[PDB]
C-alpha cells in the first residue's frame with residue numbers, strides 16, 4: 439500500500455548495481471533482436487532498463503505491485519523503449535508465458551518470494567532449451583554463523599543457503615551452472631541502504647503519523663544495522679544457469 443510509495447523514491451528496491459547487472463549479462467551469449475526476455479519481480483525496472491540498453495530483444499517486466507509497473511512504463515517512455523520493453527502487473531508463481539519460449543529469465547532480489555528451488559523448477563518450463571536463468575539471491579558465505587543473524591534470516595527468508603548448496607540445487611533442477619559470483623558490499627551500502635536514507639526524511643514527514651511508515655523505517659535501519667555487523671557472513675550472489683538438453 440504505502441510501502442510501494444516509499445520504494446518509488448529509489449532507483450532500486452534491492453541490493454545491486456549497474457556493474458553487477460552487466461557483469462551477470464557478460465555470461466549470456468544467445469541474445470539477438472529476436473530474443474524474448476522476462477524480468478521477474480522487476481520493481482521500478484532500474485536493472486531492466488540497464489539491461490535493455492545493452493541487449494537486443496523484447497523484455498517483459500513482471501511485478502506484483504501496480505505502483506512499480508506504472509513507474510516502469512513511464513521510465514521506459516522517457517527512454518523510448520516502450521516498443522521493446524513493457525511492464526506488466528503479475529506474479530512469478532502464476533505466469534502465462536508460452537512454454538519453452540523465453541531465451542532469458544532475469545530476476546534480481548526477487549526469487550525469494552517464490553523460493554529458490556521452486557523458482558528453478560517452475561521457471562524452467564518457460565525457457566527454451568539452452569535458454570538462460572540469471573538471478574541474484576541471498577546466501578551464506580560460510581558454514582557457521584552467529585545466532586543473531588541466523589535467526590533474523592529464518593524469520594525473513596528460510597531458504598537462504600550457502601553458495602555450494604545453491605549451485606547443487608541448480609544442477610539438480612536440470613541446468614548447467616554457468617557462472618556464479620558474490621555481489622560487492624557497495625551493492626548493499628552505496629546502492630541500497632544509503633539511498634534509503636534520503637528517502638526516509640522526506641517520506642516520514644509527508645506521511646506523518648502513519649504507523650505503517652514509522653515501522654517501515656525501523657525495519658530498514660534494523661536490516662542495515664544487521665548487515666554492517668554480519669556482512670562477512672552473508673550477502674547476495676548472482677547465479678547464471680543454462681537450461682539443460684541445450
Ligand SMILES: C[S@@+](CC[C@H](N)C(=O)[O-])C[C@H]1O[C@@H](n2cnc3c(N)ncnc32)[C@H](O)[C@@H]1O
Pocket residue numbers: 449450451452453454478479480481482483484485500501502503506528529530531545546547548551
Ligand atoms: C527486493 S525487490 C527487487 C526489485 C528489483 N528487481 C530490484 O532489484 O530493484 C522484490 C520485488 O519482487 C516483487 N514481488 C513480490 N512478490 C511477487 C510476486 N509474487 N510476483 C512477482 N513479483 C513479486 C516485489 O514487488 C518487488 O518489486
